[PDB]
């Protein structure tokens, strides 16, 4: 038979499952809804481990349970009472013999030790991957340190001593490759001559590589804490989502910089060379699976100031029109081809974050926090699982690093790029559109001519890499 359990009066996690406290989806069960007690029971279940559930729970629990209360509940879960001697044990003791204690030994081996270890696994994941709870609440950290540091008994000792050290490390807190990265490529601007760096003077290969390293780093820095609760849309977004916002603002600045480079090049022939260079950078972005970069370019070419430059469009080579068209087709039909491409490529890649943001926000807005069943309010856990599926996908693409060498000066150039200067957004984008109207006026106004502004060769070095010995 199954093991007997402590009385539900002395140990709350032994209450029987019922539809008043847990609901499963239609080979381990998947939870649709439950009380917090039942969620924590299944989070630390004696029959099986569920590391995905641990991640999902630790990512999303703050929408239904405070950190201080979670810690109290898992400490309660940990403190399991042992059963009393059975009749056979009693009779052995009465005869001066050692009892077999079979039921006690089984309960220790098959209930207490697995549940306790899985509680410790929750603690370990909490500290390793969700340490912000403890950064933001020093007293919570004190409680965790004290709980872990006072667990007695040899079965848990290795993990208790380990978790103590992990915590201490996290308080005061390297890549290997299968290959050498390719050689940094240079064009008109030479190493160390940052004053000459510009769209046409840096090598287009190296523009795309250095922007990809930058955008990859920005992508990799975004934590789930910046996403759950839709906090990047709320009034405190600068406090709660700074890495996400830095990432988006980089993308916005690069798109605006592309538009600015285009419309401030008043000479038609020179502007054609600018656009062609931008589409070459897009080509390298595609080769690098930098989908953020792809869309930065697409967004610039589809913007109101650029889209209307029909005279510039007429001179772009067919092969480059096709490249831009294929890139734009990734976004069509609600990103249908993008989603399929992302799921087919070999990472490293830089996903476009915007889709994740919309899906997280709509999942949180479109599903209720609780389900009402039999007069009880149950936590709607399926909603949290859906959010954690998205944050899990994000994290999966954050693991793989690019095998590309940083060029510190080119990196700094793109880090400090500021196309809008001191202008506000509306004034700056009106300026771009008025510049578009100036360089290619609306029909029937005649097309003016403009003098060249670049004194250096406009010919691209192309986007196929070179390799000296």
Ligand X SMILES: Cc1cc(Cn2c(N3CCNCC3)nc3c(C4=CCNCC4)cc(Cl)cc32)cc(C)c1F
| Site residues (vs ligand X, CB under 6 A) | 275, 298, 301-302, 306-307, 309-310, 312-313, 316, 321, 324-325, 328
The reply to whether 171 sits near other proteins by the rule CB under 8 A is no
With CB under 5 to 8 Å by kind, the binding choice for 450 among ligand X, other proteins, none is none
Q: By rule CB under 8 A, what string of x and - marks binding of each residue 261-290 to other proteins?
A: ------------------------------
Residue 350 phi, psi (nearest 5): -120, 100
Quote the CA–CA distance of 413 and 435 in Å, as a whole number: 25
Quote the CA–CA distance of 256 and 427 in Å, as a whole number: 13
Nearest CA to 71 among 81, 80, 62? 62
With CB under 5 to 8 Å by kind, the binding choice for 459 among ligand X, other proteins, none is none
Residue 304 CB, nearest distance to ligand X (Å)?
10
The reply to whether 221 sits near other proteins by the rule CB under 8 A is no
Give me the sign of the Cα torsion angle 26, 30, 33, 37.
positive
DSSP 3-state assignment of 86?
coil
Total number of residues binding other proteins (CB under 8 A)? 84
The reply to whether 345 sits near other proteins by the rule CB under 8 A is yes
Site for other proteins, residues 300 to 339, rule: CB under 8 A = 300, 302-304, 307-308, 331, 334, 336
Site for other proteins, residues 7 to 46, rule: CB under 8 A = 27-28
The reply to whether 156 sits near other proteins by the rule CB under 8 A is yes
Q: Which one, 31 or 323, has the nearer CB to ligand X?
A: 323
Quote the CA–CA distance of 146 and 46 in Å, as a whole number: 25
Q: Which one, 53 or 64, has the nearer CB to other proteins?
A: 53
With CB under 5 to 8 Å by kind, the binding choice for 312 among ligand X, other proteins, none is ligand X
Q: What is the DSSP string of 320-338?
A: HHHHHHHHHHTTHHHHHHH
Site for other proteins, residues 104 to 123, rule: CB under 8 A = 109-110, 113-114, 117-118, 120-121
With CB under 5 to 8 Å by kind, the binding choice for 222 among ligand X, other proteins, none is none
Q: What is the DSSP string of 101-156?
A: -HHHHHHIIIIIHHHHHHHHHHHHHHHHH-THHHHH-HHHHHHHHHHHHT--SGGG
Q: Beta 22-24 vs 376-380: how paired, if at all?
A: unpaired
* Degrees, nearest 5: CA angle 211-212-213: 90
With CB under 5 to 8 Å by kind, the binding choice for 201 among ligand X, other proteins, none is none
Residue 278 CB, nearest distance to ligand X (Å)?
9
Residue 125 CB, nearest distance to ligand X (Å)?
43
3-state SS of 389-420? HHHHHHHHHCCCCCCCCCCHHHHHHHHCCCCC
Using the 8-state DSSP alphabet, how is residue 197 labeled? -
Q: By rule CB under 8 A, what string of x and - marks binding of each residue 371-410 to other proteins?
A: ---------------x---x-x---xx-xxx---------
């Amino acid at each position: 038979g199954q093991m007997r359990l402590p009385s539900a009066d002395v140990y709350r996690f032994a209450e029987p499952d019922s539809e008043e406290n847990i609901i499963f989806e239609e080979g381990i069960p998947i939870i649709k809804a439950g009380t917090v007690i039942k969620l924590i029971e299944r989070l630390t279940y004696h029959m099986y481990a569920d590391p995905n559930f641990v991640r999902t729970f630790l990512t999303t629990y703050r929408s239904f349970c405070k950190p201080q209360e979670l810690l109290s509940l898992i400490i309660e879960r940990f403190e399991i009472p042992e059963p009393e001697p059975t009749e056979a044990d009693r009779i052995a003791i009465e005869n001066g013999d050692q009892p077999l204690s079979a039921e006690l030994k089984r309960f220790r081996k098959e209930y207490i030790q697995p549940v306790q270890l899985r509680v410790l696994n929750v603690c370990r994941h909490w500290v390793e991957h969700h340490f912000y709870d403890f950064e933001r609440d020093a007293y919570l950290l004190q409680r965790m340190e004290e709980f872990i540091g006072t667990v007695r008994g040899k079965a848990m000792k290795k993990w208790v001593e380990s978790i103590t050290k992990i915590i201490q490390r996290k308080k005061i807190a390297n890549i290997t490759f299968q290959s050498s990265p390719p050689t940094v490529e240079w064009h008109i601007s030479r190493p160390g001559h940052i004053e000459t760096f510009d769209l046409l003077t840096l090598h287009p290969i190296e523009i795309a590589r250095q922007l990809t390293l930058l955008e990859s780093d920005l992508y990799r820095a975004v934590q789930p804490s910046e996403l759950v609760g839709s906090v990047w849309t709320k009034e405190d977004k600068e406090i709660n989502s700074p890495n996400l916002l830095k990432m988006i603002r980089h993308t916005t600045n690069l798109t605006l910089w592309f538009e600015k480079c285009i419309v401030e090049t008043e000479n038609l022939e020179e502007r054609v060379a600018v656009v062609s260079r931008i589409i070459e950078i897009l080509q390298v972005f595609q080769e690098l699976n930098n989908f953020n970069g792809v869309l930065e370019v697409v967004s610039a070419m589809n913007s109101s100031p650029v889209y209307r430059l029909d005279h510039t469009f007429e001179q772009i080579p067919s092969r480059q029109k096709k490249i831009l068209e294929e890139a734009h087709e990734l976004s069509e039909d609600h990103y249908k081809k993008y989603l399929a491409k992302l799921r087919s490529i070999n990472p490293p890649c830089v996903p476009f974050f915007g889709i994740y943001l919309t899906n997280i926000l709509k999942t949180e807005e479109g599903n209720p926090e609780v389900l009402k069943r039999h007069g009880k309010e149950l936590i709607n856990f399926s909603k949290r699982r859906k959010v954690a599926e998205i944050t899990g996908e994000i994290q999966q693409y954050q693991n793989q690093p690019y095998c590309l060498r940083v060029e510190s000066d080119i990196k700094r150039f793109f880090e400090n790029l500021n196309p809008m200067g001191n202008s506000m957004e509306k004034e700056f984008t009106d300026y771009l559109f008025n510049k578009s109207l100036e360089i290619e006026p609306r029909n029937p106004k005649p097309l003016p001519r403009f003098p060249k502004k670049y004194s250096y060769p406009l010919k691209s070095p192309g986007v196929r890499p070179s390799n000296p010995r």
